[PDB]
Write a protein that binds this ligand. Sequence first.
Ligand SMILES: Nc1ncnc2c1ncn2[C@@H]1O[C@H](COP(=O)(O)OP(=O)(O)O)[C@@H](O)[C@H]1O
Lengths: 99, 120, 122, 61, 122, 61
Amino acid sequence: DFWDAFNGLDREVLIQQTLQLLAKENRPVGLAELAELLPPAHDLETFAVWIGMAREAGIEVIDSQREFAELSDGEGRRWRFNLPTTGLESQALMDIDWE
Amino acid sequence: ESRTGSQGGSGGEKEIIASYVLTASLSYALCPAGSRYPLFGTIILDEAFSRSSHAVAGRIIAALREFGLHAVFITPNKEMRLLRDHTRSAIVVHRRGQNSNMASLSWEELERHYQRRGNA
Amino acid sequence: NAARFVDDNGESHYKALQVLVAQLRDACERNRTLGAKALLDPRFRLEFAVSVMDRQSGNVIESRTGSQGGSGGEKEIIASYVLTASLSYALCPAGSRYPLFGTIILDEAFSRSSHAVAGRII
Amino acid sequence: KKQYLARLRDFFEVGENAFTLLNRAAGLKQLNSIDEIFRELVLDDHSAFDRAAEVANSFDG
Amino acid sequence: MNQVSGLAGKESFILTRIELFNWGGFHGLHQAAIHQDGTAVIGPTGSGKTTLVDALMTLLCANPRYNLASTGGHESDRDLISYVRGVSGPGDGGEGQSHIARPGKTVTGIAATLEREGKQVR
Amino acid sequence: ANPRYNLASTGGHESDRDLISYVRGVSGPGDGGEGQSHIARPGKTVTGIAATLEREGKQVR
Ligand SMILES: Nc1ncnc2c1ncn2[C@@H]1O[C@H](COP(=O)(O)OP(=O)(O)O)[C@@H](O)[C@H]1O
């Protein structure tokens, strides 16, 4: 468990990686599409951060419309995340400063 | 050991035993008169595990499962690995300016397999 | 004070002193009731409050006049900041703004705050 | 140890309260509202709960 | 491992949904879905995770102790009124009432649904 | 001068550990085969502690 806690989702690097991905796409990207383009190595740990994106930059997230994303972890088990629908856009996200 | 022999590291077994006793007491309290299962099976514990190691928190969750308690854990975006292993949803709460809001999220393991085209 | 001016061979003065000492003993016996602590503890006669202001606008922007009303992370942030300020002030030699004993030790300081606010503390 | 701590005080130009506060800083986990952090972390005790007992005994005499 | 989780609902009642309306910092209508397998409320410091638990605690207990996890079992940090009015922090030192989000005529609704074998209690 | 040992976990009440138990290496917490607290150094013993501080190449130990 010491080693497991040693390595974790460094949201600092993920912040810039996501920002660069939105800059490259420069289009409204959902959570499922972001997961496809960016393979999360920690599952919901990443998703919360991305939701932290939408709610931090004012990008309203819709709960009625539900997308999905199938992702396999390190040991091979595959999970289907029922993400909400969001409208992540690079402009606003780059506008907001990050800690 | 009539008296607890020792812990699993700085109160490891001690914390495990205390949490197990607390869970049993909660289950008994929620269990109706002469009932094996508590009618009110939901337990909320804010700041789920801040003073508890990952080794012990999994044990507390397992104990909560054994006593038939459905628990919702509140964490400050911390201890995501064990929460993800031992849960199947998350209510991401974010407050912007003076007003706050929620965003529900859920996930579930597809039956598929642990791995295909490999050792079974 | 009024009785010290009476001319009765120190009888009224003795009675007033007796009342005062009875109060002192009452406080001493119950050495942790809020009243006793306020009576005999210097750091219990005065309250405390923090206030976040604006660098240019001196107006108070958020004054926690005790007013606990805070999350586990908020209280942690305030406590860590105030403790760091106190340590810096204490370790600084008189008339200097740089501490001479610059090393401090924290033990499991941050547990109730998110990873984003702990970095601000550091 | 008294002389050694006096030498430390002289070298680092800080009173005993500085190092006592440094000690108390290693137990910040059990914190609460600002009032408890002030009355339990900084501005060390300096209470007068013992002097009151001596005053009471003198007044008993 | 998945077989045991089916015990939920088959034996007793489990909370499945929380409804908030003008509760604390949750302006308007907000809905939270709780999985039968257990859920995790996560977020940064200064959000509505403690407010969300406090709503359910108010719904459940006769004399709820609000903000218990942060006060360390001490005198309850808040009360029902401060949640109903949406009090956001002590509120400066010159009145203003900016901290209070619902000073005038307002209504707050808190709902909680519990399920057991289809039977639902709200 | 009078350090509060294990303040992080024992804060609020009196500390369990002391200087004697550190010199002797008592193992109060970890048991399983505890031979009466399993004093690691029961006989004649010597324990040394040293801390080094630096500033612009000037050392103080
Ligand atoms: N009565 C109140 N007084 C002050 N702030 C309040 C009150 N009720 C709710 N809040 C605010 O709502 C949030 C409640 O705590 P929260 O941050 O959700 O806890 P945590 O994230 O530690 O679980 C905080 O931002 C707090 O300032």
